């Protein structure tokens, strides 16, 4: 609790590392809500549905 | 093969474990067959094609 931001030769990888991790969830989000907030304004009823 | 599902405290676990895997699939399915759904309903020329 005390040891884990205090060595930024350790950090600055993870930072990089679990940063693209973060983006890559981003665009899978934005990609995926884009598809379905078209699909539910052509058929609500099995969007809401499911 | 006769020992398999004899254990509980083996089997438990297992059950749990696969038990989430088959459900996350399911999930999969009902969200990418919806989305397929509408689009053959708009193109069905585009979607039996590919
Ligand atoms: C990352 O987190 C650390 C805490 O783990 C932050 O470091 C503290 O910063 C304050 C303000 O200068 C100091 O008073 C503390 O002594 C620091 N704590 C330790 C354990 O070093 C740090 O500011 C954060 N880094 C960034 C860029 O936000
Ligand atoms: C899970 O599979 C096991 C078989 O590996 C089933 O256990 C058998 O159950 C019957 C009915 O009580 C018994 O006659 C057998 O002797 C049992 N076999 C062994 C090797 O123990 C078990 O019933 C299955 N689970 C469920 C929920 O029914």
């Known amino acids: 609790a005390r040891l884990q931001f205090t060595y930024n030769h ?3 990888p993870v930072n990089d590392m679990l940063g693209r991790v ?3 969830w981003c665009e ?3 990609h995926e809500l884009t598809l379905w907030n078209e ?3 052509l058929n609500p009823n099995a969007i809401a549905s499911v």
Do not use: D, H, P
Request: glycine share 0%.
């Open 10 to 12: 350790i950090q600055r």
């Open 22 to 24: 973060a983006i890559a």
């Open 28 to 30: 899978l989000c934005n």
């Open 39 to 41: 699909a539910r304004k």
